[PDB]
Symmetry: C4
């Protein structure tokens, strides 16, 4: 089930990227405001 | 049509990530400026 | 060549998301600083 | 191994996008705060 495996891997990369970006926006906000 | 289904799922994850990130930038902007 | 087509479509979505997010960070920066 | 190649290409695009966005948040932070 390689198609599904590739999708799973991509989804995990998106989930990690999203979370790190949201964290960094929030932490910048907290530093400034 | 598994290839298309995987693409659809990935596209939805990107769309959600994009929207949440843009929202959080705008809300930070509004808090500061 | 459906695999390649799906990749092309995903790549375009990432490129649009990246560009919009970078634009919005820069415009927020310009408003504040 | 086209499925794996497409996954590799997508992963690289995500990695570049993530890194550029995180850099730009940090640099904005540094300019303001
Ligand atoms: Yb987190
Ligand atoms: Yb929204
Ligand atoms: Yb642009
Ligand atoms: Yb870097």
């Amino acid at each position: 089930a390689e198609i599904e495996q590739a999708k799973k891997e991509i989804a995990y990369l998106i989930k990690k990227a999203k979370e790190e970006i949201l964290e960094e926006i929030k932490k910048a906000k907290q530093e400034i405001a």
